[PDB]
């Protein structure tokens, strides 16, 4: 029984390393639409799931109370925070204001 013919993936792996470093993905290399390459629904789902997970962790850890949690939950559903860092900054600002008032 002769062996199967070779179908090598070395070229593809070198190209994959290059594309990991950021090569070969520019304006002239894109054939599909932006939403085809990276749907906005997928990005929104990821961002909102991150925000809700962070809010649940903060509520369970008692860094925020249930009222601040509800306000931030509705604001996160309302596209107020661009990423996790923006939400964390808002939380810290609210906590500082509460500390001053208290």
């Amino acid at each position: 029984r002769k062996p199967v013919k070779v179908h090598s993936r070395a070229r593809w792996r070198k190209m994959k390393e290059a594309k990991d470093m950021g090569r070969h993905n520019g304006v002239g290399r894109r054939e599909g639409s932006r939403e085809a390459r990276m749907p906005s629904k997928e990005l929104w789902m990821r961002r909102l799931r991150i925000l809700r997970r962070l809010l649940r962790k903060y509520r369970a850890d008692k860094k925020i109370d249930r009222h601040v949690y509800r306000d931030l939950y509705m604001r996160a559903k309302g596209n107020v925070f661009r990423n996790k860092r923006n939400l964390v900054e808002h939380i810290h600002k609210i906590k500082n204001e509460k500390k001053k008032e208290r």
């Binding site: 990991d20 470093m21 950021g22």
Partner: peptide, 12 residues
């Protein structure tokens, strides 16, 4: 993955 690879670091 966690850190983006550098061409220069391939030396070592």
């Amino acid at each position: 993955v966690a850190v983006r690879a550098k061409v220069g670091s391939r030396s070592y």
